[PDB]
Amino acid sequence: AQQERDVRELVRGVAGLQDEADPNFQLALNFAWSNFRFHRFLDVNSHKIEKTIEGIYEKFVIHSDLSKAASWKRLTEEFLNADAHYSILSLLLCLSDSPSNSSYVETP
Amino acid sequence: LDVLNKKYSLLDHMQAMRRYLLLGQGDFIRHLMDLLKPELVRPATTLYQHNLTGILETAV
Amino acid sequence: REIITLQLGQCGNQIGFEFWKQLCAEHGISPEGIVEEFATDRKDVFFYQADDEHYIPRAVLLDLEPRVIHSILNSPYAKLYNPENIYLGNNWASGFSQGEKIHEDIFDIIDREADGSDSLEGFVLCHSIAGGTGSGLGSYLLERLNDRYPKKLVQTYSVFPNQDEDVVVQPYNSLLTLKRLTQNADCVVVLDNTALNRIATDRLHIQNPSFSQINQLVSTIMSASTTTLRYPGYMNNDLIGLIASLIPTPRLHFLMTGYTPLTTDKTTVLDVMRRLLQPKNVMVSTNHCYIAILNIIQGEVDPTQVHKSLQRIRERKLANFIPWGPASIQVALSRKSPYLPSAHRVSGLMMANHTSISSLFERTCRQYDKLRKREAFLEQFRKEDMFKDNFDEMDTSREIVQQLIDEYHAATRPDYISWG
Amino acid sequence: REIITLQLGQCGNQIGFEFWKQLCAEHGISPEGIVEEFATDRKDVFFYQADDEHYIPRAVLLDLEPRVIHSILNSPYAKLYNPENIYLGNNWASGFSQGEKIHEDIFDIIDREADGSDSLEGFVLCHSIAGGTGSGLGSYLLERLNDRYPKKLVQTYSVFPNQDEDVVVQPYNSLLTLKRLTQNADCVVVLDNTALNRIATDRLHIQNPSFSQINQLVSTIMSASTTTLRYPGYMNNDLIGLIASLIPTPRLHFLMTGYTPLTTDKTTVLDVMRRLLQPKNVMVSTNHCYIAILNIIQGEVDPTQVHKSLQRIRERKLANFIPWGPASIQVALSRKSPYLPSAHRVSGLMMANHTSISSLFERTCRQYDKLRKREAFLEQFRKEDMFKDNFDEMDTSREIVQQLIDEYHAATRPDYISWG
Amino acid sequence: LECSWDELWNKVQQAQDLDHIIAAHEVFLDTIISRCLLDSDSRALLNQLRAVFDQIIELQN
Amino acid sequence: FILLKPVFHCLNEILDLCHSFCSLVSQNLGPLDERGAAQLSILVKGFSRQSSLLFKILS
């Protein structure tokens, strides 16, 4: 129920289609649901996600981005304490960090 | 000291941590990067170790 | 298994007799057939399994008006084989008609040797392209074998004729014989007399006994091609497993040959790989890329460094290759042959399907078309005229070799996913 | 990488043969090419990587009417290289026409050596300005290489002619050859025979075997220029990285040379820096400031005191420099070369882009203009007349060298932010 | 790599203990971090140096 | 590559696909429709898919 509203809100947000009475909205929604129902991936390996997170930390320390490395470790360590974790991580990832070593402007 | 520098060659490792990692051998690097231009101009989403491992050898 | 060897024409009988002398000296064989005191290896490919190992070669000699056969006769190697399979002009029409009139008893000689054999796997024709008595007769008789035995393999050893044109019907003879090589043969190895004479003048200053030296060269070629069979190797102990890798198209069966030591009067395998990759170790003379390359090597090698050699030659990318398809260079290794003097211990031999031979075909096409337009170089043979009143057999062969040239050039294209 | 060396003219063949003797004695090389028992270092810059390390020099000798080539012949160093790249008047027109008629086969010699090479990076021309047979022929053939290979670097070793003017067309020959050096060459190192003879009469009392001594001097120059390549150094192992620092303008590629030990029959690096900053260690003879100075050193140094040396030479402000732009003096260091006698252990060599050479150019301009106004010193060559009826090639070269003199003098100005 | 290489080269080739060799290699490797711009203080300077490498590859286009 | 790996299972799968491929094309003969196209489609799709997977086991 909330699922359907969430998939509609995702189409509106990412695709920039705020009018549900646009046929392009319904085409994007049908595409999104048919993509969700075409089961073609293995389930998430938590250990592979952990290895990737640790490697991202290593790449930050190799590039002497100490503030980004410390923040990366700190945030990933806090988030992984209370499955869906590793899901969201892989989801965001697909590669790694963008703006390679130039996004360490933490205000707080 | 006498066994560590001949049987496990503690000195030559420092020599080859200098030539390569500290990039002290500059003859290797120019022909390396000369041969390495088509690999690096491709984005490394489509680079793998199997493309790398023996253009290493042509350089060596 | 059991392959019956065919020698015909002056040139073909020459290299066949030389190669049988090569295999007699090579294995532990007396000049009488007697197994010697240093003979183990696989000895049933051409060798008759007699009781006291009289390894009688499966050698069928058939010609007419014998000249060089007399020179074969006064020799102790006429006692090596004789199961009574030896049988006693220079144009295609004359040889064709002479093969026509006596086809029955020589085919009875073929059949007697065939049922006398345990099995039959291939016909190896010792020949030369437009070899005089070999031409016409060989194309006719090759049609008789291909009609009569369609379940066997045909390999034709021949050389490209270069006699500096004198017979003027030679492009016609080679054109019709080449038609028969396309449609009645499954493998044709041709070599340039020009490039072989160039290598002979390169390594030494001798070019005058060219017949004797070229017998040594093609006898080394053929012994090296069969060494994996005649000595216990692992693969290509069938002819067909060797042929299958070279051929993607059963009309493109024409192969280029090269040999890595050009002097004989050792080192690692990467080096001979780089040598054979040069076109000056090749015995044969736009853009042309090979379809598939396979090499045989015999000598003293490091069994791990052959991996390293393919690795470095690959990552060198020292070759091109063809757009359409995953082939490779192919390595094959066998023993260095004992019981002979072993000088320049690494000897390599390459079989490659190359599109450069289409230019050589086009040279003969242009020669045939020129003499056809002039139409004064057929000499009006009456045998040719009654055989073909309109001489459209030559037109049909020119159509065939043109279709092959089209297949060659579309195989150069990446559109050999489509038709060539 | 791989650079092919060109020697031509009497003078150029002299210093080329001397320099090849220098590199044979320098590395562990026999007079036959055999690697010796004291040979490691980088040996593929001019050295053919043979199997038994027959380090065959990439040395192409091309001239006509051989005189000094016979003196090269009766020597064991004719067995060092011969891949058959050695090939058998004194005016620009005569040499130009003689190079024109045989350009094809000697360019085939060039192409054979080029594809025989693994790569091509530079052409090093052993020459002298108006070198007799070298002049005309070299300018023509240099145009052929620059047209035929536009992706390579040209360095021309030559000396400024001083024969006390006898050929009277010598300013014309040097003017046209200098035009070709401007437009078909990217680097020209010229040296004054006057100043070299002054240094020879300075250090010793010998000036009479001037050819033999000057071979030693420029062979030391060229071995020192390539020592960072031929022995494992760190930078300027490419020619182009060395050339790039010297040149802000691709027509200003004319460099001054100096050498810090003037006697050979040690001390710190600050001292040789101060020595080389003096103009009496310079081998070459208004206000003139250098554009960029770079020095190579070879010897026994303190690796921290080179920092201190640049620090003290900077804060001394012992030089001027040019208004337009941040350049520097540039230090470069390599090994003192083993396997030769090492006397006066520090030997330094300097490459500098100086505006003082525009005066030398203007001297030759004034000589050419004087002989042109008189117009009795061309001797009416028929080859020159049919080559150019109006002799406006000399007018165009005089325009080119005048544009270069203007670039020199506006580069002396701070207005080389604007056009020169 | 030349004054630095000298310091390391002395402090190994005389060193009569393994622990002296270890701490000779240590301070040497840490000192090269301070000579270059990879230090905690000099990250801003490294950013300045990155901004002058952008125009070099930009000049290629 | 006889030791139990994922690689070894892929190689066994290739061999079994090759065996089933040989059985059809041997009995087929000279070119003739014998309801061959459906079996052919399954076979050629399997070869393409698994050969694509074998480019992912090359590193």
Side-chain angles (χ1 to χ4, degrees), chain A residues 1-96 99 108, chain B, chain C, chain D, chain E, chain F:
Chain A
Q2 175 75 33
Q3 193 150 59
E4 192 181 308
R5 183 179 181 271
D6 282 330
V7 181
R8 290 178 127 83
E9 269 288 86
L10 169 147
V11 169
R12 285 207 279 274
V14 190
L17 261 180
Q18 300 89 341
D19 175 30
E20 298 204 27
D22 196 340
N24 281 346
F25 180 84
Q26 195 59 46
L27 290 174
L29 190 66
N30 293 346
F31 165 75
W33 271 113
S34 47
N35 276 47
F36 293 154
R37 295 163 188 161
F38 180 31
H39 297 313
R40 63 202 183 266
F41 303 107
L42 186 47
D43 195 1
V44 184
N45 191 284
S46 288
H47 178 255
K48 297 297 289 184
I49 300 313
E50 292 270 349
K51 289 292 143 295
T52 310
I53 294 320
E54 170 194 313
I56 293 312
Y57 173 73
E58 302 275 13
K59 188 196 74 70
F60 287 157
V61 311
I62 279 169
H63 294 57
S64 314
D65 204 342
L66 272 301
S67 51
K68 215 180 196 190
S71 54
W72 173 252
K73 168 180 272 201
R74 195 255 309 171
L75 294 155
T76 50
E77 284 278 338
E78 303 324 314
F79 169 63
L80 282 164
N81 308 329
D83 303 334
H85 310 268
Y86 312 94
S87 157
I88 299 158
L89 303 168
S90 44
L91 170 63
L92 301 155
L93 269 154
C94 177
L95 56 101
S96 41
Chain B
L1 290 167
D2 283 328
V3 62
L4 262 185
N5 54 23
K6 284 208 195 75
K7 202 187 185 301
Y8 303 107
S9 201
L10 179 53
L11 181 74
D12 297 11
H13 290 81
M14 297 183 197
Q15 179 52 236
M17 284 173 186
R18 195 272 306 143
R19 290 171 51 115
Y20 310 135
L21 302 189
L22 314 179
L23 297 95
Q25 198 49 70
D27 282 1
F28 172 60
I29 302 300
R30 59 175 306 281
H31 181 60
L32 167 74
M33 294 199 55
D34 184 22
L35 297 175
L36 215 58
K37 298 192 293 185
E39 307 87 304
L40 299 162
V41 300
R42 179 183 328 134
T45 57
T46 44
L47 299 194
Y48 312 96
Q49 209 177 61
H50 54 63
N51 311 295
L52 201 49
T53 34
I55 78 225
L56 184 57
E57 300 185 343
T58 47
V60 167
Chain C
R1 221 71 57 77
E2 278 72 74
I3 297 175
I4 279 187
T5 13
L6 291 176
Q7 56 181 357
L8 72 157
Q10 50 178 357
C11 285
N13 290 321
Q14 280 162 262
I15 127 97
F17 170 70
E18 184 44 61
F19 176 79
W20 289 129
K21 185 139 50 58
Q22 157 65 41
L23 260 58
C24 170
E26 171 159 9
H27 310 267
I29 305 176
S30 79
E32 298 85 23
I34 308 300
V35 45
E36 304 278 72
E37 19 34 274
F38 63 97
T40 91
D41 43 330
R42 158 71 173 176
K43 297 299 292 296
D44 209 348
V45 271
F46 316 104
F47 310 107
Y48 165 57
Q49 283 314 295
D51 159 67
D52 225 328
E53 285 86 8
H54 321 284
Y55 290 124
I56 293 180
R58 294 176 183 116
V60 198
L61 186 140
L62 321 174
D63 345 62
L64 191 56
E65 296 170 52
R67 192 265 302 162
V68 76
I69 297 104
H70 310 327
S71 63
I72 297 176
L73 275 173
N74 36 6
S75 58
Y77 305 100
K79 325 174 302 178
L80 196 83
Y81 53 94
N82 202 13
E84 297 310 304
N85 48 354
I86 300 172
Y87 174 74
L88 310 176
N90 300 276
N91 305 123
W92 199 93
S94 51
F96 188 84
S97 18
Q98 282 161 324
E100 164 60 56
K101 61 177 175 63
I102 62 178
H103 66 294
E104 277 307 301
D105 64 354
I106 64 194
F107 187 57
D108 195 33
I109 294 174
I110 294 167
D111 294 330
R112 176 195 49 83
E113 292 288 283
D115 328 312
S117 71
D118 168 65
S119 68
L120 209 63
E121 197 146 85
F123 299 92
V124 182
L125 267 72
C126 313
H127 204 231
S128 93
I129 303 297
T133 67
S135 105
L137 175 120
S139 34
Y140 174 79
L141 222 28
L142 167 76
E143 287 161 322
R144 309 289 70 68
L145 348 138
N146 208 238
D147 293 336
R148 269 294 299 112
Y149 303 102
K151 310 305 168 226
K152 319 295 168 177
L153 252 119
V154 186
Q155 192 180 174
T156 303
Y157 287 95
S158 28
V159 289
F160 183 81
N162 174 260
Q163 285 68 247
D164 308 303
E165 299 183 59
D166 186 67
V167 141
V168 297
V169 75
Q170 164 173 284
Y172 306 88
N173 309 328
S174 15
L175 184 73
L176 301 169
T177 322
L178 206 63
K179 180 178 173 184
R180 268 74 174 189
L181 289 182
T182 50
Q183 65 183 357
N184 312 109
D186 300 340
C187 251
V188 169
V189 270
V190 89
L191 287 99
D192 283 359
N193 304 328
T194 64
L196 295 160
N197 184 32
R198 284 180 200 107
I199 295 176
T201 51
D202 185 37
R203 58 155 303 159
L204 288 173
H205 299 284
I206 46 177
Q207 67 273 14
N208 282 305
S210 341
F211 295 91
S212 84
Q213 312 313 303
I214 196 174
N215 288 315
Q216 323 313 297
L217 304 177
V218 213
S219 314
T220 51
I221 291 171
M222 292 174 17
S223 341
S225 70
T226 57
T227 278
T228 182
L229 290 90
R230 307 168 293 108
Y231 283 93
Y234 188 77
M235 275 186 267
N236 290 340
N237 302 325
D238 49 342
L239 171 66
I240 184 181
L242 179 108
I243 297 316
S245 229
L246 290 165
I247 292 184
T249 322
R251 311 286 87 180
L252 312 182
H253 43 84
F254 303 88
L255 318 161
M256 316 277 284
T257 64
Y259 187 71
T260 343
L262 297 183
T263 5
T264 311
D265 302 345
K266 202 95 178 189
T267 119
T268 188
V269 306
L270 172 75
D271 282 321
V272 259
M273 267 285 203
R274 208 183 323 164
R275 294 180 182 98
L276 196 50
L277 242 169
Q278 310 168 297
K280 291 191 168 180
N281 292 51
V282 178
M283 321 176 215
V284 201
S285 315
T286 147
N287 166 270
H288 284 311
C289 339
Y290 306 87
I291 304 297
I293 302 179
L294 157 67
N295 54 93
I296 193 61
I297 199 181
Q298 52 184 357
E300 307 314 302
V301 298
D302 214 16
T304 130
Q305 283 204 156
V306 259
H307 154 61
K308 291 305 183 64
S309 163
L310 268 74
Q311 168 77 237
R312 300 149 189 157
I313 291 299
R314 197 268 177 179
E315 293 290 80
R316 183 49 190 86
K317 304 278 190 168
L318 192 56
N320 52 13
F321 264 127
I322 207 65
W324 57 285
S328 311
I329 220 185
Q330 294 192 325
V331 70
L333 192 149
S334 135
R335 312 168 37 179
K336 189 63 177 186
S337 166
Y339 318 132
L340 305 98
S342 205
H344 291 207
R345 275 277 191 174
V346 272
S347 297
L349 170 61
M350 87 92 77
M351 321 304 305
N353 211 340
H354 203 197
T355 59
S356 40
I357 200 57
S358 165
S359 67
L360 264 298
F361 296 154
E362 192 273 331
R363 293 193 334 167
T364 26
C365 291
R366 153 223 64 193
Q367 287 169 248
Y368 158 72
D369 284 331
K370 162 187 173 176
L371 303 191
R372 193 63 173 89
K373 287 188 305 294
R374 294 182 64 163
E375 209 24 86
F377 307 98
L378 198 72
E379 307 309 287
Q380 193 55 254
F381 307 133
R382 300 317 301 159
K383 324 295 298 177
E384 191 84 55
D385 202 10
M386 307 299 181
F387 154 75
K388 194 62 184 51
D389 282 316
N390 277 304
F391 317 106
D392 297 349
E393 295 292 327
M394 323 162 179
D395 189 24
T396 325
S397 182
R398 163 277 64 92
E399 185 181 40
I400 289 300
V401 66
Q402 199 41 250
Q403 286 175 202
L404 264 64
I405 288 173
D406 298 335
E407 285 154 52
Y408 274 136
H409 296 340
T412 305
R413 303 310 176 276
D415 330 17
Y416 202 81
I417 299 173
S418 278
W419 298 275
Chain D
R1 221 71 57 77
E2 278 72 74
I3 297 175
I4 279 187
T5 13
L6 291 176
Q7 56 181 357
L8 72 157
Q10 49 178 357
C11 285
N13 290 321
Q14 280 162 262
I15 127 97
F17 170 70
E18 184 43 61
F19 176 79
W20 289 129
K21 185 139 50 58
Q22 157 65 41
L23 260 58
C24 170
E26 171 159 9
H27 310 267
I29 305 176
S30 79
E32 298 85 23
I34 308 300
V35 45
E36 304 278 72
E37 19 34 274
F38 63 97
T40 91
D41 43 330
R42 158 71 173 176
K43 297 299 292 296
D44 209 348
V45 271
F46 316 104
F47 310 107
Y48 165 57
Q49 283 314 295
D51 159 67
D52 225 328
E53 285 86 8
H54 321 284
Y55 290 124
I56 293 180
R58 294 176 183 116
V60 198
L61 186 140
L62 321 174
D63 345 62
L64 191 56
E65 296 170 52
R67 192 265 302 162
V68 76
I69 297 104
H70 310 327
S71 63
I72 297 176
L73 275 173
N74 36 6
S75 58
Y77 305 100
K79 325 174 302 178
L80 196 83
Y81 53 94
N82 202 13
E84 297 310 304
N85 48 354
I86 300 172
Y87 174 74
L88 309 176
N90 300 276
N91 305 123
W92 199 93
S94 51
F96 188 84
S97 18
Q98 282 161 324
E100 164 60 56
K101 61 177 175 63
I102 62 178
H103 66 293
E104 277 307 301
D105 64 354
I106 64 195
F107 187 57
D108 195 33
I109 294 174
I110 294 167
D111 294 330
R112 176 195 49 83
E113 292 288 283
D115 328 312
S117 71
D118 168 65
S119 68
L120 209 63
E121 197 146 85
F123 299 92
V124 182
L125 267 72
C126 313
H127 204 231
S128 93
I129 303 297
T133 67
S135 105
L137 175 120
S139 34
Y140 174 79
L141 222 28
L142 167 76
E143 287 161 322
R144 309 289 70 68
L145 348 138
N146 208 238
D147 293 336
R148 269 294 299 112
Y149 303 102
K151 310 305 168 226
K152 319 295 168 177
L153 252 119
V154 186
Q155 192 180 174
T156 303
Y157 287 95
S158 28
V159 289
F160 183 81
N162 174 260
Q163 285 68 247
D164 308 303
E165 299 183 59
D166 186 67
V167 141
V168 297
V169 75
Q170 164 173 284
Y172 306 88
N173 309 328
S174 15
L175 184 73
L176 301 169
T177 322
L178 206 63
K179 180 178 173 184
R180 268 74 174 189
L181 289 182
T182 50
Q183 65 183 357
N184 312 109
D186 300 340
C187 251
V188 169
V189 270
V190 89
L191 286 99
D192 283 359
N193 304 328
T194 64
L196 295 160
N197 184 32
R198 284 180 200 107
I199 296 176
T201 51
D202 185 37
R203 58 155 303 159
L204 288 173
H205 299 284
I206 46 177
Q207 67 273 14
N208 282 305
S210 341
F211 295 91
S212 85
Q213 312 313 303
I214 196 174
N215 288 315
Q216 323 313 297
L217 304 177
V218 213
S219 314
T220 51
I221 292 171
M222 292 174 17
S223 341
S225 70
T226 57
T227 278
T228 182
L229 290 90
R230 307 168 293 108
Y231 283 93
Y234 188 77
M235 275 187 267
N236 290 340
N237 302 325
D238 49 342
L239 171 66
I240 184 181
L242 179 108
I243 297 316
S245 229
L246 290 165
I247 292 184
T249 322
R251 312 286 87 180
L252 312 182
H253 42 84
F254 303 88
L255 318 161
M256 316 277 284
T257 64
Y259 187 71
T260 343
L262 297 183
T263 5
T264 311
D265 302 345
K266 202 95 178 189
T267 119
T268 188
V269 306
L270 173 75
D271 282 321
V272 259
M273 267 285 203
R274 208 183 323 164
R275 294 180 182 98
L276 196 50
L277 242 169
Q278 310 168 297
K280 291 191 168 180
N281 292 51
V282 178
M283 321 176 215
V284 200
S285 315
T286 147
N287 166 270
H288 284 311
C289 339
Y290 306 87
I291 304 297
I293 302 179
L294 157 67
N295 54 93
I296 193 61
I297 199 181
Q298 52 184 357
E300 307 314 302
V301 298
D302 214 16
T304 130
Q305 283 204 156
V306 259
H307 154 61
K308 291 305 183 64
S309 163
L310 268 74
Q311 168 77 237
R312 300 148 189 157
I313 291 299
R314 197 268 177 179
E315 293 290 80
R316 183 49 190 86
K317 304 278 190 168
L318 193 56
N320 52 13
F321 264 127
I322 207 65
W324 57 285
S328 311
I329 220 185
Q330 294 191 325
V331 70
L333 192 149
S334 135
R335 312 168 37 179
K336 189 63 177 186
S337 166
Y339 318 132
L340 305 98
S342 205
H344 291 207
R345 275 277 191 174
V346 272
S347 297
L349 170 61
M350 87 91 77
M351 321 304 305
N353 211 340
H354 203 197
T355 59
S356 40
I357 200 57
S358 165
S359 67
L360 264 298
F361 296 154
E362 192 273 331
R363 293 193 334 167
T364 26
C365 291
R366 153 223 64 193
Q367 287 169 248
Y368 158 72
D369 284 331
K370 162 187 173 176
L371 304 191
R372 193 63 173 89
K373 287 188 305 294
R374 294 182 64 163
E375 209 24 85
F377 307 98
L378 198 72
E379 307 309 287
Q380 193 55 254
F381 307 133
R382 300 317 301 159
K383 324 295 298 177
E384 191 84 55
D385 202 10
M386 307 299 181
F387 154 75
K388 194 62 184 51
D389 282 316
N390 277 304
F391 317 106
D392 297 349
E393 295 292 327
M394 323 162 179
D395 189 24
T396 325
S397 182
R398 163 277 64 92
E399 185 181 40
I400 289 300
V401 66
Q402 199 41 250
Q403 286 175 202
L404 265 64
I405 288 173
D406 298 335
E407 285 154 52
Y408 274 136
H409 296 340
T412 305
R413 303 310 176 276
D415 330 17
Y416 202 81
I417 299 173
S418 278
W419 298 275
Chain E
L1 199 80
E2 198 174 296
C3 323
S4 312
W5 152 242
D6 195 3
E7 306 138 17
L8 176 83
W9 181 240
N10 308 137
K11 278 183 303 188
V12 187
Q13 292 300 107
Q14 69 187 240
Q16 307 180 344
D17 194 43
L18 171 52
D19 203 27
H20 302 167
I21 297 173
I22 293 162
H25 187 261
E26 282 180 43
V27 62
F28 177 62
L29 263 64
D30 303 345
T31 291
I32 296 171
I33 303 296
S34 43
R35 282 195 176 271
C36 73
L37 281 308
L38 273 64
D39 204 52
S40 156
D41 302 6
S42 78
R43 283 186 258 191
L45 282 298
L46 178 56
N47 304 342
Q48 313 315 124
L49 183 60
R50 292 310 297 261
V52 314
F53 293 158
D54 297 342
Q55 300 295 326
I56 298 173
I57 190 68
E58 180 56 48
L59 193 64
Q60 191 62 69
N61 312 277
Chain F
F1 318 124
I2 191 56
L3 174 64
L4 271 75
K5 297 179 298 302
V7 171
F8 174 49
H9 307 326
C10 308
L11 296 156
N12 297 332
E13 283 169 61
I14 297 304
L15 292 174
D16 304 337
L17 174 70
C18 288
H19 164 81
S20 43
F21 171 48
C22 293
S23 48
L24 180 62
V25 304
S26 45
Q27 311 170 260
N28 174 257
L29 264 180
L32 177 62
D33 190 13
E34 301 180 275
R35 215 196 54 85
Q39 296 172 351
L40 178 65
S41 49
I42 301 300
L43 282 169
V44 299
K45 284 175 187 292
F47 185 82
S48 315
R49 289 170 288 200
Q50 286 168 358
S51 46
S52 73
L53 308 190
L54 262 52
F55 299 148
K56 187 46 178 176
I57 303 168
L58 191 42
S59 303

